[PDB]
UniProtKB/Swiss-Prot annotation:
There is a cross-link at K62 (Glycyl lysine isopeptide (Lys-Gly) (interchain with G-Cter in SUMO2)). The keyword Amino-acid biosynthesis does not apply. Keywords: Chromatin regulator, Chromosome, DNA-binding, Isopeptide bond, Nucleosome core, Nucleus, Ubl conjugation. GO terms for biological process: brain development; establishment of protein localization to chromatin; heterochromatin formation; negative regulation of gene expression, epigenetic; negative regulation of transcription by RNA polymerase II; negative regulation of transcription of nucleolar large rRNA by RNA polymerase I; nucleosome assembly; positive regulation of keratinocyte differentiation. One of its GO terms (molecular function) is transcription cis-regulatory region binding. Variant histone H2A which replaces conventional H2A in a subset of nucleosomes where it represses transcription. Nucleosomes wrap and compact DNA into chromatin, limiting DNA accessibility to the cellular machineries which require DNA as a template. Histones thereby play a central role in transcription regulation, DNA repair, DNA replication and chromosomal stability. DNA accessibility is regulated via a complex set of post-translational modifications of histones, also called histone code, and nucleosome remodeling. May be involved in stable X chromosome inactivation. This is Core histone macro-H2A.2. It is found in: Nucleus; Chromosome. The nucleosome is a histone octamer containing two molecules each of H2A, H2B, H3 and H4 assembled in one H3-H4 heterotetramer and two H2A-H2B heterodimers. GO terms for cellular component: Barr body; chromatin; chromosome, telomeric region; extracellular exosome; nucleoplasm; nucleosome; nucleus. Residues 7-192 form the Macro domain. It comes from the Eukaryota. Belongs to the histone H2A family.
Length: 192
């Protein structure tokens, strides 16, 4: 499991047996999380000014900022829905999977979020990861309501495992920090 510091709040197992787990911890514990790939929701430029970026950057130090800087020139700007992977020596996670999340209210923004999440799982499988964690999506000006984000992301994950051939992914974790968020995800996960 994700190990000391991480509580499994709730769990659902999908039709092909992949397990979805709601987990809680302190942001500050992110770089000890025992999962093979962590998702970093971000912008085209792959910034690290949000709570998760900050914690991954602090945990990963110089080597990590360096690996990110290089990726922006290597690949970016990331198109909307695109994911790209950093090696993350210094974390328990083998890789961080950056992804460009669309803005709330854009054209077919729900369908683009869904492509985003699928592209995150694709990138995890391409690296043959056995587990991946999704932290909380951002909130504010141009951000998805929590309801809709939980709804789409859950829907994308199951659809992905339907369409995917021989996924290495057995465990998908949702990192959650607040009660309202925890509650919403539980509500949506019950729609099964």
């Amino acid at each position: 499991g994700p190990g000391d510091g991480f509580t499994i709040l709730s769990s659902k197992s999908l039709v092909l047996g992949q397990k979805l787990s709601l987990t809680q911890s302190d942001i500050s514990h992110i770089g000890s999380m025992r999962v093979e790939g962590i998702v970093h929701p971000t912008t085209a430029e792959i910034d690290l000014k949000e709570d998760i970026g900050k914690a991954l950057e602090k945990a990963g130090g110089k080597e990590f900022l360096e690996t990110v800087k290089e990726l922006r020139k290597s690949q970016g700007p990331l198109e909307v829905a695109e994911a790209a992977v950093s090696q993350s020596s210094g974390l328990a996670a083998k890789f961080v999977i950056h992804c460009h999340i669309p803005q709330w209210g854009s054209d077919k923004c729900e369908e683009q979020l869904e492509e985003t999440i699928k592209n995150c799982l694709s990138a995890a499988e391409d690296k043959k990861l056995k587990s991946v964690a999704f932290p909380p999506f951002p909130s504010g000006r141009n951000c998805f309501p929590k309801q809709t984000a939980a709804q789409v992301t859950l829907k994308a994950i199951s659809a992905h495992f339907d369409d995917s051939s021989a996924s290495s992914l057995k465990n998908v974790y949702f990192l959650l920090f607040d009660s309202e968020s925890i509650g919403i995800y539980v509500q949506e996960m019950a729609k099964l």
